[PDB]
Every structure is written in structure tokens, then in C-alpha cells.
Amino acid sequence: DLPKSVDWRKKGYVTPVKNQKQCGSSWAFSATGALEGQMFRKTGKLVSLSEQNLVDCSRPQGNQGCNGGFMARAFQYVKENGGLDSEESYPYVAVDEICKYRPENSVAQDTGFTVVAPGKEKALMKAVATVGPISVAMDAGHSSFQFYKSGIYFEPDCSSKNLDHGVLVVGYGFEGANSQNSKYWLVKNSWGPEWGSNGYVKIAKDKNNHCGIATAASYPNV
Amino acid sequence: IILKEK
């Protein structure tokens, strides 16, 4: 059956917390996070990937650089493009720039991606437990989220359908000794390690898809 | 589908 708790950071699949700064590129950090976990599973090497490569080059797939985008479009770009560069070879500058993708600097590839059935938290749990970190969209436009600090995040104003931020679910768990109470999703954000809990947030889990965590989740196929 | 971030 599925584990009671999962935390892929303890297994080497997750890079340190990054910062998107003033660019609306959360979608790009969510996509690189999921790709960093799948590459690690395939090769045993953790290599930080280029969000800038995605910001500058994926407009043909429908992304809008610093104005917005979507993780599934980023994985499509990776598929159609044949690769994705490392962060060290294509650094992040938080502004839309000229596409400078270099195939010789590619350290990741995908063949498309798999989507988790919309709105199904149990299906999201199955994906997290069997695959690795999963890219998800959520409604993050709340001052309570901006000022989040500890504990399980639960916000009555959250929507499960109007989403505006891409994040990465790296695990799940519960508080206490009963595995079925006070559950939460372990989510990595892209607002720097100074935001939230060392850059992470526990979002209420199994509470009717809180903030839309399971509404649009997906992962790359490597 | 796109997340309007800015």
C-alpha cells in the first residue's frame, strides 16, 4: 500500500531552494524541480537545471516568460527541443532575454509528460509516492501565504480552480502518531529559503483539494 | 493553460 509519509529531500532528489525574484516564472522553477528529481532517479546525479533556458526559449509552446506559463508547456518544450541546459551553463537573471539554448550544455531530456487525474488528491499521493517530486499549480494569491511561516497552511479564501503559482510537491505527511490526521503536502516554493519554512510550506492535505494542489499536477517522462 | 503570474 502507499507509505504514510514521503520526503524526497531526504533521498537526494531535490536541489536547494531557489528564488524567482521579480519575474513571474514559478512555472519554470516547478518544471525544473520535477525534472531535477527525474534525472536524479535515472542517473544518480543531482544537477541544478536552467529556469532561464525555459523563460527565454519556450514561447512557441505557449509560455510567456516572466509574465507566466505552465509546467506541462515547459516539459513539451523540453521534449520538442531535445534537451535543457544546466543552471551553471545558463544562469538565472530574472528577466526575459534572448534564447541561448546550447545543446552541448544539455543535462536533461524528457519524452513528454504524465498528468495526474484532475482534483484527485489520492492520485497525487500515489504519484508522489511512486515517481518522485510532482509539479503542481495552486492558488497562492493571499497575504496569508505571502506571510506564511510555520505549521499547516489552510486558507479559507483559497480556490481550487483559479490558480496562479507553480510549486513542487516533494512529499507528504501528517502531524502526530495517527497517519490519517492533520495531513499535509510538503511543497517547495521558489521565493528563496527566507520565505516560509526554509523555502517550504505544508499545505493542508485531504481537505477537498485545498488551494487546487491536485487540479493540475504533472511530471516529466525521462 | 497558463498561470498568469504578472
Numbering used by the authors:
A (entry chain AA): 1 to 222
B (entry chain PA): 444 to 449
Reproduce text from the manuscript describing this model.
Hence, we set out to determine the crystal structures of cathepsin complexes with representative peptides of cleaved substrates. Reactive site mutants C25A and C25S of cathepsin V were used in structural studies.
The pattern III group (binding shifted to the primed side) consisted of structures of eight non-protected peptides that all bound uncleaved into the primed sites. Electron density maps in the region from P1′–P3′ and partly P4′ of molecule A enabled an unambiguous interpretation. On the non-primed side, the MPD molecule occupied the S2 site, and the CL- anion occupied the same position as the carbonyl oxygens of P1 residues in pattern groups I and II. Three sequences TRESEDLE, EVCKKKK, and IILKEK were among examples of cathepsin V single protein cleavages, but they were cleaved two or three times in the peptidyl form. Peptides from patterns I and IV bound to cathepsin V consistent with the observed protein cleavage sites, whereas the peptides from patterns II and III did not bind according to their cleavage site found in proteins. In its absence the affinity for the negative charge, as manifested by the binding of Cl- ion, prevailed over amino acid sequence of peptides of group III.
